Amino acid sequence: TAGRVVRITGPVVDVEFPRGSVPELFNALHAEITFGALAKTLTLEVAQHLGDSLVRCISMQPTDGLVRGVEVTDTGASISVPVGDGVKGHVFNALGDCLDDPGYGKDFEHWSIHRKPPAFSDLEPRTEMLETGLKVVDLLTPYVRGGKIALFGGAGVGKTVLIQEMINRIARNFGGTSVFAGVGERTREGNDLWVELADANVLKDTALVFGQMDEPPGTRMRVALSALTMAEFFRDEQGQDVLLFIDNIFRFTQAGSEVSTLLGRMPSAVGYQPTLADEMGELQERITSTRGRSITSMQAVYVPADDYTDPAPATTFAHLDATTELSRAVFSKGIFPAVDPLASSSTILDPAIVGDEHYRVAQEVIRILQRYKDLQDIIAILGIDELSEEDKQLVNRARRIERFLSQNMMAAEQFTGQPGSTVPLKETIEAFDKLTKGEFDHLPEQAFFLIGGLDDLAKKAESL
């Protein structure tokens, strides 16, 4: 019944099987490498059938040291990954092998990574806003329950602190869990994150999945589908809400283009795989809510050359509902969590989906900050004394709104020792409504930093 390795070319391996025993495509096959310094069990994913009982495969591990004619055993199932509560607090590669303690999780139920999105009858027939409890997010760029949120930033902009924050939010408010997909993550960053989530003590509710850059493009492609198959089990069988981070969804597009090129298929516009808009669809359509339970997603997206027309971002931005952008120019002012209130955007911010009052207050806050953003040049070059009295009264409010977006987020409890706040939506729309009308202008900027809710602003104002 076992097959033979019959050709090898880079990461690509062809295998031949006894006439009746040809494996179904997207099965996983195991093959041994027996040279001492490179001893491995090699995992192959079946890509095509070439006729003559030959099967075209790609390797999830380096093919180096593999010999022609070696035996290949078909596992009779797809690539499969462990699912259960015991996945939480561990680091896994795309194949479901643990990195923190090798051979862990063999006894868990194993699910196929390749499985359909929800049937048409199961979907929720309207978007619902997610009350995450962060002032800036809930007001300026409301998130969608079971939607996808793009994230932009880098190092020195609090991005790892916002990740620890959103993990704490889901665990403590919704009683959910998080999954993190390191889709082509730097090995150094994967270790800095594993240590950071351990020191924060949030790791105890998160499953980490890493597809490292060190490994062939079959693994860097399949990691996202592996992490999403752990999140799907938590939505469907445990009945929890889930938050799936993807860092970075561009490398899922790139790795797909490199597997399509190794399979020798003709490349499309600017060199991507011909399946691209379907191949991204089979991942993004699967992140959704059904039957009152939901998989929210945050997705760090790289843009090549900074142009939003390129097929990799232009396919990606078709799917996602909100865009949070972090700015060094806001972090350098001390304004944590450093979300830029003008560059960030959301598609659920409409008077039909959120209340008319919320839309009015969001349009007012955007207008006031857009005026101050226009005025910053005059302030920097000519000083506040060069203004009139009508616009200097606007800057007196804009300074305070820009501060009042800041929050004592739960991720900071590691350092400040005070607990993190979680303001109701119905409070933050009142607080910015009162603040835009100027009812707090007699308080100094130091009364608004890191403050949380409005009754807390009253407690810090009487302290100062």
Binding site: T9, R188, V195, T261, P267
Partner: protein
């Protein structure tokens, strides 16, 4: 002096050792050869990347394994190959010798000596393609790699374990920035402490032979040839040696790393690594993707670079630091190779030819270069000084157009313009003069603490170089205190400002004015 006993002993010792194991082994025959490739029929038991030895003494890598015949790229002496030649297999995947005897030697990618300075005392052997240290074996980057360039260590710090990309156009000083980095380490190496000693590999890919000799002569003059190995794949060597040269520099590096040394690798330059792999791959008829590169070229660079790491205490706490160089056509950073390496590396020192011409040498674009490690790679005394420097240079880059109209500009930013113009002078530096950490912290201090504000712009580098010579004579205790405590204590600061004012009274500007 040369003697008959040693020449007779060596020959007799080979002669009396000469024998053959006569062992049964698999042989194939060359069916095809062209352009640096041969195809070998037979060899049923060959493995992917096995060293094949051909009858003219030349070697090949067996990089492709078709149904009918092996495809083997040929290392070097390609003209000696003919159809019907018997191909023997060596019983192993590609390996290189490793050890401390490589220090000060120039070697070809197989680890054979190419400087002509006799045979190398190989200490151990490593396969070229062993697993990189996994995510559980690493430790957070937290020790400086002192570059000795003000424009780097003050703004894009390199910690030992980091992967920093020296991306720029040709003739912008990429090689000069990496030679300064390798030269700088002598000030550490002369100490016996294995924690402070950094060992350097420089991997030259597709350089002309005199340019490798020019680098060797520049490292000899600095004394760096006590502690540095040059891996030479000059442009004459076949595409196979150019493709292996980064991997063999990494495979030498890893042996020192896993023994608990600290290593620096410079790859010069990975654009010619990629261009050599594309040659091999298209001759082997493998399918082209974007910009004609084969599918796996991100994986080619990644499996190379992701072997640079800092190890945990259980693996002796060693590290390896990668400075890959790449060359960019007409300053673009959206071409395939630059886009791959910018995504693989931790930080990116964009060098730009426009700044090189304007006088800002070395040409670091401080407005776009970054390091994802940041402050964890800087000593406390440098955080205490450089923490505002990026902000000052960003505000100066915004203000730059107002220089035509500085009378009308408000004084609170006129001072920021006069500061920024002095910081852009303070960051210039002549080649082969790397500054020790204890001297560059005092250089960045002069600008950032505003003591330099009274010097005219055209005199700034002369003032910096004169003060650093003055202090290095009369008051070395400032530098000793900085180095030994890693902190600029208030006593050292009050002593330094007293000595800056005392030096100003002894200085003169190029227009003849006082500066006090």
């Amino acid at each position: 002096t040369i003697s008959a006993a040693d020449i007779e002993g060596a020959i007799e010792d080979y002669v009396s050792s000469f024998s053959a194991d006569t062992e049964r082994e698999e042989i194939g025959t060359v069916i095809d050869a062209g352009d640096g490739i041969a195809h070998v029929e037979g060899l049923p038991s060959v493995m992917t990347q096995e060293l094949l030895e051909f009858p003219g003494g030349v070697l090949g890598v067996a990089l492709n394994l078709d149904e009918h015949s092996v495809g083997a790229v040929i290392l070097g002496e390609f003209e000696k190959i003919e159809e019907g030649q018997q191909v023997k297999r060596t019983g192993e995947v590609l390996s290189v010798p490793v050890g401390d005897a490589f220090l000060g030697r120039v070697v070809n990618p197989l680890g054979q000596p190419i400087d002509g300075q006799g045979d190398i005392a190989a200490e151990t052997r490593r396969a070229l393609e062993l697993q990189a240290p996994s995510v559980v074996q690493r430790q957070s980057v937290s020790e400086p790699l002192q570059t000795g360039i003000k424009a780097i260590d003050a703004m894009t710090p390199i910690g030992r374990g980091q992967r920093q990309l020296i991306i720029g156009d040709r003739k912008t000083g990429k090689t000069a920035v990496c030679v300064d980095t390798i030269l700088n380490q002598r000030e550490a190496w002369l100490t016996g402490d294995p924690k402070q000693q950094v060992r350097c590999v420089y991997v030259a890919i597709g350089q002309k032979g005199t340019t490798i000799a020019s680098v060797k002569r520049a490292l000899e003059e600095g004394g760096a040839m006590e502690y540095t190995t040059i891996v030479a794949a000059p442009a004459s060597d076949a595409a196979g040696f150019k493709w292996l040269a980064p991997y063999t520099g990494s495979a030498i590096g890893q042996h020192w790393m896993y023994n608990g040394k600290h290593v620096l690798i410079v790859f010069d330059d990975l654009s010619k690594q990629a261009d050599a792999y594309r040659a091999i791959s298209l001759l082997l008829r493998r399918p082209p993707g974007r910009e004609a590169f084969p599918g796996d070229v991100f994986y080619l660079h990644s499996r190379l670079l992701e072997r640079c790491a800092k190890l945990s205490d259980e693996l002796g706490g060693g590290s390896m630091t990668g400075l890959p160089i790449i060359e960019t056509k007409a300053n673009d950073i959206s071409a395939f190779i630059p886009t791959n390496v910018i995504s693989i590396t931790d930080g990116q020192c964009f060098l730009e030819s426009d700044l090189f011409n304007q006088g800002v040498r070395p040409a670091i674009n401080v407005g776009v270069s970054v390091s994802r490690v940041g402050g964890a790679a800087q000593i406390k005394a440098m955080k205490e000084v450089a923490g505002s420097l990026r902000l000052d240079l960003s505000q100066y880059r915004e203000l730059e157009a107002f220089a035509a109209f500085a009378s009308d500009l408000d004084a609170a930013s006129k001072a920021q313009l006069d500061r920024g113009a002095r910081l852009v002078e303070l960051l210039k530096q002549p080649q082969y003069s790397p500054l020790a950490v204890e001297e560059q912290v005092v250089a960045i201090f002069l600008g950032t603490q505003g003591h330099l504000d009274s010097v005219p712009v055209e005199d700034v580098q002369r003032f910096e170089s004169e003060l650093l010579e003055h202090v290095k004579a009369s008051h070395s205790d400032i530098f000793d205190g900085i180095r030994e405590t890693k902190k600029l204590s208030e006593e050292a600061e009050e002593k330094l400002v007293s000595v800056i004012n005392e030096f100003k009274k002894g200085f003169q500007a190029s227009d003849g004015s006082s500066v006090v």
